[PDB]
């Protein structure tokens, strides 16, 4: 229907990346605020931008959680990669967690130039991990939401706005530790 040079017909294909579920995580976007990363066909992480916080304490008991060793190792790996990918994170009170019973709950407090803030770094990482589709100087991002919440979930057809894709996670793998600050002289 669209002929080029008289003898070349233009044809197209679209890849079904959903078939890769067993060997790599797949991220997708439901809408502007809600995104998912499924690991296999059983479990995954839902990341939500929201004004409604679910944690009201300042703890993130990562070492004790490692001690008990009840969480899903792949999900903990994804959490670690996400957090290590944030540029210039320097406000530890902005991050709270709950891991009791092997659950994964992580909450970033985005409340407050707006560029050199935890909100900007967290939001850039969030934009990169799903890459599914206000404006600030250079690469700076701002939103009206007060919290970013990351909780484990079971598989469900969440990909209403964008197709599942491994690209965001794979791209973020190289970002790990690239922009962390030193907090002591002997790492």
């Amino acid at each position: 229907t669209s002929l080029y040079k008289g003898v070349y017909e233009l044809q197209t294909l679209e890849l079904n990346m959903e078939t890769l579920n067993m060997t790599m995580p797949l991220s997708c976007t439901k809408n502007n605020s809600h995104h998912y990363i499924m690991v296999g066909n059983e479990t995954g992480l839902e990341l939500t931008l929201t004004n409604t916080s679910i944690i009201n304490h300042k703890f993130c008991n990562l070492s004790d959680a490692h001690k008990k060793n009840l969480y899903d190792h792949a999900l903990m790996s994804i959490i670690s990669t996400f957090h290590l990918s944030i540029p210039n994170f320097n406000q530890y009170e902005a991050m709270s967690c709950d891991f009791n019973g092997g659950k994964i709950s992580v909450q970033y407090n985005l409340s407050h130039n707006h560029c050199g803030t935890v909100a900007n770094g967290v939001l850039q990482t969030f934009m990169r991990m799903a890459w599914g589709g206000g404006r600030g100087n250079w690469d700076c991002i701002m939103t009206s939401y007060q919290y970013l919440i990351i909780q484990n979930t079971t598989w469900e057809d969440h990909c209403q706005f964008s197709r599942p894709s491994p690209i965001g996670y794979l791209g973020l793998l190289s970002q790990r530790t690239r922009d962390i600050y030193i907090s002591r002289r002997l790492l």
Binding site: Q11, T12, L13, L15, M17, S77, I167
Partner: protein
């Protein structure tokens, strides 16, 4: 470093040294086989998104067939293989194009030319997106013309070399 994964031999004999995408790997649930000429470019080029997706799918298939698959995932395996399979900088470039308002590749859709009579095709190129929608074909028809010119020139040069050899 640079990617290193060799594509496994194509199941279809129509393309002796090419590669075939089965019905599961495509949204249109059909079989698409590409010849050795188009697939050979994937061994030397560094900026072809399609060749990175081919390496990803081939790694997936081989891992499922040679390793005992279980539902629990070995995130470590892909973590170590990633840079042997794809150029992460291609991803970074598409991210940079996205944040600057330039049309970019989101790895879903690809276009290629088909020489109907012979069945020979070109290496698929990513269909760019802008403003939340795929680019209209008229916006990149110049690139399509360029691809057609390349397909003509390389073929002519091969026939010349043939005539030379005989």
């Amino acid at each position: 470093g640079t990617f290193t994964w060799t594509l496994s031999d194509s199941e279809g004999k129509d393309t002796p040294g090419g590669y075939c995408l089965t019905r599961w790997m495509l949204i249109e649930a059909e079989l698409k086989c590409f010849g050795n000429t188009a697939v050979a470019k994937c061994n030397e080029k560094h900026d072809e998104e399609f060749c990175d997706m081919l390496r990803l799918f081939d790694f997936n298939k081989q891992a499922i067939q040679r390793l005992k698959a279980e539902a629990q995932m070995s995130i470590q395996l892909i973590n170590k293989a990633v840079n042997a399979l794809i150029n992460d900088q291609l991803i970074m470039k598409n991210h940079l194009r996205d944040i600057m308002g330039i049309p970019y590749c989101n790895y879903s859709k690809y276009w290629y030319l088909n020489h109907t009579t012979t069945g020979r095709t070109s290496l698929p190129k990513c269909w760019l997106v802008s403003n939340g929608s795929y680019l209209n074909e008229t916006h990149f028809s110049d690139d399509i013309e360029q691809q057609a010119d390349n397909m003509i020139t390389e073929m002519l040069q091969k026939e010349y070399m043939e005539r030379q050899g005989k």
